[PDB]
């Protein structure tokens, strides 16, 4: 099935907002933390420092949440979940949960091919 | 600078640009200059008398 | 140690941030408490008469509206 064509997807920023000086200490995760140091140069917004997330980086609402294939991901755990996406098959694609086994995955993939429902991680074929 | 908007706001702008084209006309401008100079000079000379 | 003694440096800005509020108008909070007593007593008697008159006029207006 073909996804519905949308406006061209424009990302205001591709790089992640990573925690300040996380590369220098192995224990620090790259997950963003708001710098609250009084003398922090990231918090004070010096020119040569990395940026902080704010509302201005938010993505265009028309193309928000859309995967590169053009669809939007909907988690799917069994065969019966495919019928929720039957009518909106050009807008949503099914994402089989990681913990669904290979057996039930065979069932899901067969049904999804029969229904013309896109599977984001349904391997091979078509 | 947009003709649509300028004419929409001022429906009379066609006549104004027509008059401007008339004033820019070389023969019209030269005739008007000669006539204006003669007329004003005559009026001033009669006034001082 | 020694510190700064006194300043009025930021005080006008703070006073004007929520602004200097204008006075309560003359028609509000016009209490006569503490004014010259004889005039207040005479005005009290006049006001009691006026309340009686207001009740009488209201009764007459109700009577006239009913009769009409």
């Amino acid at each position: 099935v073909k996804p519905t064509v949308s406006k061209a997807i424009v990302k205001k920023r591709t790089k992640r907002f990573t925690r300040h000086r996380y590369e220098l200490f192995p224990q620090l995760s790259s997950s963003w933390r708001k710098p609250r140091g009084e003398d922090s140069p990231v918090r004070r917004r010096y020119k040569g420092q990395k940026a902080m997330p704010n509302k201005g980086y938010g993505s265009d609402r028309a193309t928000k949440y859309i995967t590169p294939s053009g669809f939007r991901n909907f988690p799917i755990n069994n065969v019966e979940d495919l019928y929720m996406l039957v009518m909106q098959n050009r807008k949503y694609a099914g994402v089989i949960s990681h913990t669904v086994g290979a057996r039930k995955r065979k069932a899901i993939v067969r049904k999804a091919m029969e229904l013309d429902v896109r599977l984001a991680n349904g391997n091979a074929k078509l | 600078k947009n003709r649509r908007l300028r004419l929409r706001l001022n429906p009379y702008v066609k006549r104004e640009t027509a008059a401007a084209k008339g004033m820019r006309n070389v023969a019209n401008r030269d005739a008007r200059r000669k006539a204006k100079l003669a007329r004003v000079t005559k009026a001033k000379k009669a006034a001082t008398k | 140690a020694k510190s700064k003694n006194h300043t009025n440096h930021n005080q006008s800005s703070k006073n004007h941030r929520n602004g200097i509020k204008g006075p309560v108008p003359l028609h509000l909070h016009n209490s006569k408490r503490g004014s010259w007593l004889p005039a207040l007593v005479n005005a009290r008697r006049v006001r009691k008469h006026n309340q009686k008159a207001a009740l009488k006029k209201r009764r007459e207006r109700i009577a006239a509206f009913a009769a009409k």
Binding site: - | - | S31, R33, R61, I62
Partner: protein, 197 residues
């Protein structure tokens, strides 16, 4: 770069939804939001705004107050005209101090059992706000009423009781405590009862 100094002081706290979890309040809010948007009458707008309000701001009203204001309206009302519907956006509570009342049509969010019994016994009718919407969608010939909040103990406790001109109750569990020093002239001073303002 625009000099907007104190522009946030202009903003006021406006609420457009209810904190109430009562689903029937939600239904009434839906109905009167639609009515206030689609009907020109200011009665519907006031009713919607009051339905949004909190419980403390939808104060209860006694039945005797309704009777008194409806009588005050009844005089100077043409005898041909029918009496207005009393509309309260809070609770209506009975009043044991007024045994005899006329037959009044009252619309309220809630009636106490005694108040409903009194209204029905007097010959009147207790109306529901959707019944009011059906019989008076615009609000024509209605008496919109509010309860009194100035007599609540919270209001009686507001302000400092020690400044002159103040007659607010203190926060004191013991009544005999806090009665001597700033309260009697003999205990070196008394807080002045009056202050010119």
């Amino acid at each position: 770069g625009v000099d907007l100094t104190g522009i946030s002081k202009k903003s006021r706290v406006i609420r457009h939804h209810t904190y109430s979890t009562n689903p029937y309040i939600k239904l009434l809010i839906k109905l009167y939001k639609f009515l206030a948007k689609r009907t020109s009458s200011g009665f519907n707008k006031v009713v919607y705004q009051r339905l949004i309000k909190s419980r403390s701001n939808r104060a209860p009203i006694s039945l005797s107050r309704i009777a008194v204001v409806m009588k005050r309206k009844a005089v100077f009302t043409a005898k041909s005209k029918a009496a207005p519907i009393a509309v309260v956006v809070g609770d209506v509570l009975d009043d044991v101090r007024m045994a005899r009342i006329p037959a009044m049509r009252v619309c309220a969010l809630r009636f106490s059992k005694s108040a409903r019994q009194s209204i029905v016994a007097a010959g009147g009718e207790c109306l529901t706000f959707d019944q009011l919407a059906m019989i008076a969608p615009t609000g024509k010939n209605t008496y919109l009423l509010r309860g009194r909040k100035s007599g609540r103990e919270s209001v009686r406790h507001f302000g400092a009781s020690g400044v002159p001109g103040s007659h607010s109750k203190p926060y004191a569990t013991n009544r005999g405590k806090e009665t001597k020093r700033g309260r009697r002239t003999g205990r070196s001073y008394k807080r002045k009862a009056f202050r010119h303002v």
